């Protein structure tokens, strides 16, 4: 599951009538394409991620060095008994977690969710771009496809206008599959099928 | 004070901030936002895909 | 003075206090009176005019038998009656 | 947190230095026209965001959500401890009642 979204459409007085509020899964800023964005390139983020993780394993091996003097500095003056062997066992593995959460935060900053503060990357452009995928690789769109006059042109115009905005190649349609001919509309259960 | 005396607290909106020609170019813009005119807060054309909102 | 009779009436609470404005002839030298009045009400100098005391102000400025007021308070149905008059 | 943010502002001032040689290295060979002034304007502010998200991720790692991988910190011990609050400071409990 790369992407998920929900969206509320526009002011109206008709509740069963659909709208296009979900077209803003593809929202991005195209005012200035003179500079290609650096962050979409997969090898740019990899050399930004590598220079961060070696900054983390340097942070880890340095803080074990601080942990040696910190035993006699703050733990020998805590009790009348000297139990200083387990104190290093408690905090060497505590460094191991707080080094490990920094690895997972570095990878989520540069592989998983790098697009979350960039307006020039759509939510749906940047969800796929975590996997080095282009917009040209969404192949099928399982439409909602509920056999009404209003839905099947609104659903069709939404997929057309989000694939128009994200830069599909001209002549790469998505294949619309329309399961509700077969299973019917199970109104609550629709998106699971 | 104005609303509690004149029974107009809930001002039911009849128009959206976007126009029907501008509901979709707002949706594709992460930066296009509402300006004020005529004491109403509506969208405009010059705020959409602007060269001035990414500096 | 009949506007300031609303300001004591607005900013006092559940009290029945005697007025700072017992007789309208106290307003014959206002600038020392208005300051001594608004030190008893420091919160009047910071709270805006209430809307109940705003349409009251418009009802004072257009009251019958009065001299017409030397300014315009609203652009409304009654503008020329506020203007040329 | 302080040793991380000074590692970030060092990361920011270093990557602007890389941005100078990267103009003639990868942008002068992209078009027949030379528009190299806006290319620095596009990417100095792009460094400014990807430095800013690292500040917000560093603070969330050390002030907001530092407890999310530690089992020795409760969810309710560590929610309050973001604000330097103890468990002795929840004063009222509005019961379901």
Give the domain extent around C23: 1-74
Task: Answer yes or no: are the C-beta atoms of C1 and C24 closer than 8 Å.
Answer: yes
Compare CB distances from A23 to B16, B27, B53 and report the shortest one's residue: B27
How many angstroms is the resolution? 2.8
Element (H, E) at A141: strand A140-142
d(CA B47, CA B39): 18
Is residue A77 exposed (0-12), middle (13-18) or buried (19+ Cβ within 10 Å)? exposed
B2–C52 C-beta distance less than 8 A: no
Burial of B48 (0-12, 13-18, 19+ CB in 10 A): buried
Angstroms from B50 CA to nearest CA on chain D? 14
CB A163 within 8 A of CB A134: no
Q: Return the percent helix, strand and coil in chain D, to nearest 5.
A: 70, 0, 30
- Looking from the CA of A21 toward its CB, the CA atoms found within 13 Å total 11
A140 forms bridges with which residues in the sheet? A175
CB atoms within 10 A of CB A59: 17
Dist. CA A160–CA B40, nearest whole Å? 32
Rounded distance, CA D48 to CA D15, Å? Answer: 10
Q: Is C10 helix (H, G, I), strand (E, B) or coil?
A: helix
A142 sits in which H/E element: strand A140-142
A118 touches chain D (CB under 8 A): yes
Question: CA of C76: how far to CAs of C3, C60, C72, D46, in Å?
Answer: 21, 16, 10, 52
Cα–Cα–Cα angle for C35, C39, C40, rounded to 5 degrees: 125
Q: What is the CATH number of the domain that holds C43?
A: 1.20.930.70
Which residues of A fall within a CB distance of 8 Å from B40? none
Method used to obtain the model: cryo-EM
């Amino acid at each position: 599951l790369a992407m998920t979204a929900t969206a509320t459409d526009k002011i109206g007085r008709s509740v069963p009538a659909p709208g296009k509020g979900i077209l803003t899964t593809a929202r991005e800023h195209h005012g200035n394409l003179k500079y290609p964005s650096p962050l979409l390139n997969i090898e740019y983020r990899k050399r930004q991620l590598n220079k961060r993780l070696e900054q983390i394993k340097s942070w880890e091996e340095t803080e074990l060095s601080y942990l040696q003097e910190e035993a006699e500095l703050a733990k020998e003056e805590f009790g009348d008994e000297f139990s200083m062997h387990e104190f290093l066992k408690e905090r060497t593995e505590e460094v191991y977690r707080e080094s490990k959460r920094q690895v997972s935060d570095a990878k989520k900053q540069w592989g998983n969710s790098f697009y979350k503060s960039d307006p020039r990357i759509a939510p749906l452009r940047g969800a796929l771009a975590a996997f080095n995928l282009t917009i040209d690789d969404i192949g099928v769109a399982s439409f909602h496809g509920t056999s009404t006059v209003a839905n099947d042109k609104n659903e069709s115009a939404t997929i057309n206008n989000m694939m128009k905005h994200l830069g599909r190649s001209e002549g790469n349609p998505v294949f619309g599959v329309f399961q509700k001919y077969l299973t019917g509309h199970p109104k609550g259960a629709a998106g699971a099928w | 004070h104005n609303a509690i005396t004149r029974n107009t607290m809930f001002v039911a909106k009849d128009k959206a901030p976007y126009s029907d020609e501008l509901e979709q170019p707002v949706y594709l813009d992460p930066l296009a936002r509402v300006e004020e005119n005529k004491k109403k807060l509506v969208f405009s054309d010059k705020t959409i895909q602007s060269s001035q909102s990414y500096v | 003075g009949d506007f300031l009779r609303r300001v004591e009436e607005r900013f006092t609470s559940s009290a029945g206090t005697v007025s700072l404005l017992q007789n309208f002839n106290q307003l014959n030298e206002p600038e020392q009176f208005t300051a001594d009045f608004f030190e008893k009400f420091p919160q009047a100098g910071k709270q805006l005019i209430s809307e109940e005391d705003c349409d009251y102000f418009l009802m004072l400025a257009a009251r019958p038998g009065q001299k017409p007021v030397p300014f315009v308070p609203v652009l409304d149905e009654r503008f020329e009656f506020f203007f040329k008059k």
